[PDB]
Each structure stands twice: as C-alpha cells, then as structure tokens.
A paper describes a structure:
Crystallographic refinement was performed using a model containing DGCR8 residues 300–355 and water molecules, and resulted in final R and Rfree factors of 0.2068 and 0.2280, respectively. The frog dimerization domain crystal contains a single polypeptide chain in the asymmetric unit. The chain forms a dimer via a crystallographic twofold symmetry. After strand β3, the polypeptide chain extends through a hinge loop into a fourth β-strand (β4) that interacts with the WW motif of the partner subunit, forming a continuous β-sheet and resulting in an apparently domain-swapped dimer. The dimerization domain structure of frog DGCR8 is very similar to that of human DGCR8 with some differences at the N- and C-termini. In the structural superimposition, the side chain of frog Cys354 points toward a direction distinct from that of human Cys352, as supported by a relatively weak but substantial electron density.
Human DGCR8 is composed of an N-terminal region that is required for nuclear localization, a central heme-binding domain (HBD, residues 276–498), two double-stranded RNA-binding domains (dsRBDs, residues 500–700) and a C-terminal tail (CTT, residues 701–751). The HBD is a dimer and each HBD dimer binds one heme molecule. The HBD coordinates the heme Fe(III) using two thiol/thiolate groups from the highly-conserved Cys352 residues contributed by both subunits. The dimerization domain is an integral part of the heme-binding domain in human DGCR8; it aligns residues important for heme-binding in proper spatial positions.
Author numbering:
A (entry chain A), B (entry chain A): 300 to 355
Write the structure that this text describes.
C-alpha cells in the first residue's frame, strides 16, 4: 500500500540526526513517527497505516 | 529528566497492540511517538526530549 499523505498542517523534514521528523507548523508540535488521520476509526482497534508504524 | 507534558489538545492512550498512541482529539490525528512542543527551537538541530525519541 502507498504511503498515506500527512494530515493538514503537517510537514515532513529531516532532523540533523538523519531521522525524519514531522512538524505541525501552526502549533509548533513535533513527532518522530509519521502522523495520520484516524477519522471515524477506532483509536484502540484500528490497524495503523504501514508508513506510521513505529519499530516493532 | 521528567517526561515532558503533551502539547494542548493531545491525549495518550493505549492501542490494543499494547503500544501507546497519541491522539489529537480535534483533528483526529494519531502518532505512535510522543508529540512535544518545539516552540522556538530549531526543527533540524534541537535535541528531542527523551520521552519522544523513537527506537534508535
């Protein structure tokens, strides 16, 4: 399956460590795992998109 | 150093897989790594808080 697009307001860049980081520009919030839109999906039970799964 | 608080609008819960997930309630956006407020820090050069570093 293709990489899911980022949700609105987010951008992917690369940190000097060589790892990608994801910035929500307006809130200045960063995460080191690709964020995605859950929508009406179940937070506890949904299957995450492959591009967003962390190690494990 | 203590765990950094989540930014506004975010909540940590646990996915059925046993891993934590972080939900921004209003946008329905999820990430699997703890988000944090970067503020005036440099996106490329800042040192991330320990609780937000992914595997590696």
């Amino acid at each position: 399956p293709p990489t899911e697009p980022l949700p609105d307001g987010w951008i992917m860049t690369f940190h000097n460590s060589g790892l990608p980081v994801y910035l929500h520009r307006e809130t200045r919030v960063v995460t080191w795992s690709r964020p995605y839109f859950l929508g009406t999906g179940s937070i506890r039970k949904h299957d995450p998109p492959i591009s967003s799964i962390p190690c494990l």
